[PDB]
């Protein structure tokens, strides 16, 4: 019952931002990903009609060059500029990446499902420099799917350099696809706030359809805005149109050295912030967060949140996604794998690595690292872990988790058969050290961790 601090850091991080069940966060009811998704899609409307789910759609979009009138009554129409067009296309792409949607641009007099246009004045003809943007849900009525933005806002005119502009495009397109705010609130109507949120997870950390900052739920993006669908947004849009299983089906790398060709999944250098919820449909994938010096916490479990590059709760993995590998930076990181076979690289700094179930390959990197094992199922003989760069007298292998079944006894070269004993065996021929653990209740030796290098008894934490 007396686990080490290394074990505890993993145990707690695994429960970072727990949600659903009968939990109460910030004095509010906590929603699971699916409950949040249902709430966001409560209008039960999409381009396929009402109460239609898991149905794909082929949609058209258009950059209006002129208008007969804006459905809201606003005036002073202004067409989209070149930068707005490029950014809007990227926002559209971030939605079609995760849901079974196709977007085709149309021009001229052709009608379109989703339209884009700017406004600058109100119905009275007075300049409006206060509002931001709005959009209309799918439907057969005049203006359905149309989105409008205030050209008097610099973030709207320069969405490529002012992050909130791109986020706004993604947000409004969300409405044009059938998504609603996580709560019954609208701009201008009263002075709504996070206090009015129906559930705890109503923030930018979980949905860009929210109006509330990520700080409301404990996350911190240091003034940045993600610009792409977050975890609950992905579940929501997929509920309506189905998941896109053709996206990034090869071996994908997110973060540094990314091969995604998506700005929000790419970090060009250490001064670049990352804010994203990853959707990936196949292949062996890697979270490369090697360019950071900040202490990071990386979790590869689906639905989980990570603390990357000095930010908090800025990276998450969507439900239905399996990410396999992770690379930390020069800081003192915590790398947590999932049930798949993971390759974890701590990088420089003193790191804590936890492979979890499956046959993992672990690299501590330079520094004083700790490889944690919380269960006999973590490294069975049939699917054993490899610690490929273990440093005798420097690194540590943490087995404190087994204390719950009785303190482990270290034996030199033979098992007594009693149980709860650990042994290290050196093979001079291949320079491999086999770490064997005979667990209580096991009639045979079923736990093994193979080490490429030497290891001392004092390197094993029992």
Least separation in angstroms between residue 414's CB and Ca ion is 26
> Using CB under 5 A, which of the segments 14-22, 347-355, 419-427, 452-460 binds Ca ion?
347-355
- What's the CA gap between 312 and 177, in Å, rounded? 29
How many CA atoms are closer than 13 Å to the CA of 260, on its beta-carbon side? Answer: 28
DSSP-assigned letters across all residues of 7-67: HHHHHHHTTTT--STT-EETTEEPPPHHHHHHHHTTT-EETTEES--S--EEEEEEE-S--
- What's the CA gap between 227 and 94, in Å, rounded? 9
Sites for Ca ion among residues 391-420 (CB under 5 A): 391, 395
214 near Ca ion, rule: CB under 5 A = no
Least separation in angstroms between residue 316's CB and Ca ion is 15
- What's the CA gap between 284 and 367, in Å, rounded? 27
- What's the CA gap between 188 and 167, in Å, rounded? 19
> Using CB under 5 A, which of the segments 10-18, 108-116, 275-283, 434-442 binds Ca ion?
275-283
> Based on CB atoms, which residue is closest to Ca ion, 138 or 349?
349
Binder among 74, 216, 233, 385 for Ca ion (CB under 5 A): 385
356 near Ca ion, rule: CB under 5 A = yes
Least separation in angstroms between residue 345's CB and Ca ion is 8
Least separation in angstroms between residue 329's CB and Ca ion is 5
> Using CB under 5 A, which of the segments 92-100, 103-111, 270-278, 322-330 binds Ca ion?
322-330
Sites for Ca ion among residues 280-309 (CB under 5 A): 280, 283, 285
333 near Ca ion, rule: CB under 5 A = yes
Q: Per the residue annotation, which of 172, 214, 324, 439 is the catalytic one?
A: 172
> What is the C-alpha R_g of the chain?
26
Least separation in angstroms between residue 124's CB and Ca ion is 52
The closest alpha carbon to 17, from 179, 219, 283, belongs to 219
Q: Determine the angle formed by the axes of helices 163-177 and 82-96, rounding to 10 degrees.
A: 50
For the chain, report the end-to-end CA distance as a whole number of angstroms.
12
The maximal CA–CA distance of the chain, rounded, in angstroms, is 90
Count the neighbouring beta carbons within 10 Å of the beta carbon of residue 263.
18
> Based on CB atoms, which residue is closest to Ca ion, 52 or 448?
448
Binder among 291, 346, 374, 376 for Ca ion (CB under 5 A): 346
Q: Is 172 a catalytic residue?
A: yes
> Based on CB atoms, which residue is closest to Ca ion, 37 or 353?
353
Binding-site ranges for Ca ion (CB under 5 A): 248, 252, 280, 283, 285, 322, 328, 333, 337, 342, 346-347, 349, 351, 355-356, 358, 360, 364-365, 367, 369, 378-379, 385, 391, 395
| Residues assigned a catalytic role | 172
């Amino acid at each position: 019952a007396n686990t080490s601090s290394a074990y505890n850091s993993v145990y707690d991080f695994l429960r970072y931002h727990d949600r659903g069940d009968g939990l109460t966060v910030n004095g509010k009811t906590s929603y699971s990903i699916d409950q949040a998704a249902a709430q966001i899609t409560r209008e039960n409307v999409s381009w396929n009609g009402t109460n239609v789910f898991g149905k794909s759609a082929n949609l058209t979009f258009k950059f209006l060059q002129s208008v007969s009138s804006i459905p809201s009554g606003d005036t002073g129409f202004v067409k989209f500029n070149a930068e707005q067009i490029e950014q809007a296309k990227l926002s559209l792409q971030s939605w079609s990446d995760v849901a079974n949607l196709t977007f085709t641009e149309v021009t001229g007099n052709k009608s379109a499902n989703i339209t884009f246009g700017n406004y600058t004045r109100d119905a009275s003809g007075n300049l409006d420099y206060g509002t931001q943007a709005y959009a209309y849900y799918p439907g057969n009525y005049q203006g359905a799917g149309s989105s409008w933005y205030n050209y008097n806002q610099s973030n709207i005119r320069n969405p490529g350099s002012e992050e909130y502009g791109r986020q706004t495009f993604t947000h409004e397109i969300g409405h044009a696809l059938g998504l609603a705010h996580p709560g019954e609130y609208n701009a201008g109507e009263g002075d709504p706030s996070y206090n009015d949120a129906v559930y705890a997870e109503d923030s930018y950390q979980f949905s860009i359809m929210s109006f509330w900052g990520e700080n409301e739920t404990g996350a911190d993006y240091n003034g940045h805005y993600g610009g792409a669908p977050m975890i609950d947004d992905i579940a929501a849009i997929q509920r309506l149109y189905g998941a896109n299983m053709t996206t990034r089906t090869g071996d994908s790398v997110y973060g540094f050295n990314s091969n995604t060709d998506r700005d929000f999944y790419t970090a060009t250098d250490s001064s670049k912030a990352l804010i994203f919820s990853v959707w990936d449909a196949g292949g062996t994938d890697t979270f490369d967060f090697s360019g950071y010096s900040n202490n990071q916490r990386i979790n590869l479990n689906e639905g989980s949140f990570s603390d990357v590059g000095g930010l908090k709760g800025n990276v998450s993995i969507a439900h239905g996604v399996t990410i396999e590998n992770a690379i930390g930076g020069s800081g003192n990181d915590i790398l947590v794998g999932n049930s798949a076979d993971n390759i974890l690289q701590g990088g420089a700094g003193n790191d804590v690595l936890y492979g979890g179930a499956g046959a993992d390959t672990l690299y501590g990197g330079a520094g004083r690292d700790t490889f944690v094992y919380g269960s006999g199922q973590d490294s069975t003989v049939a699917a054993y872990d490899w610690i490929a760069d273990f440093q005798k007298g420097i690194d540590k292998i943490d087995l404190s988790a087994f204390r719950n079944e009785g303190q482990l006894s270290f034996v030199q070269d033979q098992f007594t058969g009693k149980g709860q004993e650990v042994m290290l065996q050196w093979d001079a021929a291949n320079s491999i050290t086999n770490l064997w653990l005979h667990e209580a209740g096991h009639s045979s030796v079923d736990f093994l961790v193979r080490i490429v290098g030497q290891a001392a008894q004092s390197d094993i934490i029992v």
